[PDB]
From Swiss-Prot:
The modification Phosphotyrosine is found at Y27. The gene is FABP4. This is Fatty acid-binding protein, adipocyte. The keyword Cytoplasm applies. It holds the Pfam family Lipocalin. GO terms for molecular function: fatty acid binding; hormone receptor binding; long-chain fatty acid binding; long-chain fatty acid transmembrane transporter activity. Forms a beta-barrel structure that accommodates hydrophobic ligands in its interior. A motif (Nuclear localization signal) lies at residues 29-39. InterPro entries: Calycin, Fatty_acid-bd, ILBP, Lipocln_cytosolic_FA-bd_dom. The lineage of its organism: Eukaryota, Metazoa, Chordata, Craniata, Vertebrata. Keywords: Acetylation, Cytoplasm, Lipid-binding, Nucleus, Phosphoprotein, Transport. The modification Phosphoserine is found at S20. Monomer. Homodimer. Interacts with PPARG.
Length: 139
């Protein structure tokens, strides 16, 4: 019943809009996303809402492709069904200033890193040798 303190993660909180994407189709291909899903997913310019309440972080994506929402505690594995409909086991940790999100499914793994750079939030999606960089701006 008191007002809690802030945290470093507060740099991520807010409302973000996708402004650029690079190599996302190739990332999705490497992940195993099929043709029609890649085409539709690649058009979307989501709004991402990041919030924190105590130890719980929520990342919501409001998207013309597929809305998603995850809530989690750093270091604590959870179930996630991804925008492309994978059922994955995810763990998100804060490593320095970078949120590191590892998704595991069917013996595969991909990592999504989120970092503040100037006024942007940069999202770096890595499947094996293939990286996609997605830049969000404040909405
Ligand atoms: C493999 O497919 C994927 C993977 C990651 C995302 C989220 C990318 C972002 O938050 O900007 C979205 C999709 C469709």
């Amino acid at each position: 019943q008191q007002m809690g303190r802030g945290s470093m993660c507060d740099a991520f909180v807010g409302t973000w809009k996708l402004v650029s994407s690079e190599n996302f189709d190739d990332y999705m291909k490497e992940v195993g996303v099929g043709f029609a899903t890649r085409k539709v997913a690649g058009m979307a310019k989501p709004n991402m809402i990041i919030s924190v309440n105590g130890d719980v972080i929520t990342i919501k994506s409001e998207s013309t492709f597929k809305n998603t929402e995850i809530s989690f505690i750093l270091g604590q594995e959870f179930d996630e069904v991804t925008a492309d409909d994978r059922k994955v086991k995810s763990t998100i940790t804060l490593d320095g200033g970078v949120l590191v999100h590892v998704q595991k499914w069917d013996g595969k793994s991909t990592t999504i890193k989120r970092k503040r750079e100037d006024d942007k939030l940069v999202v770096e999606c890595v499947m094996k040798g293939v990286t996609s960089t997605r830049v969000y701006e404040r909405a």
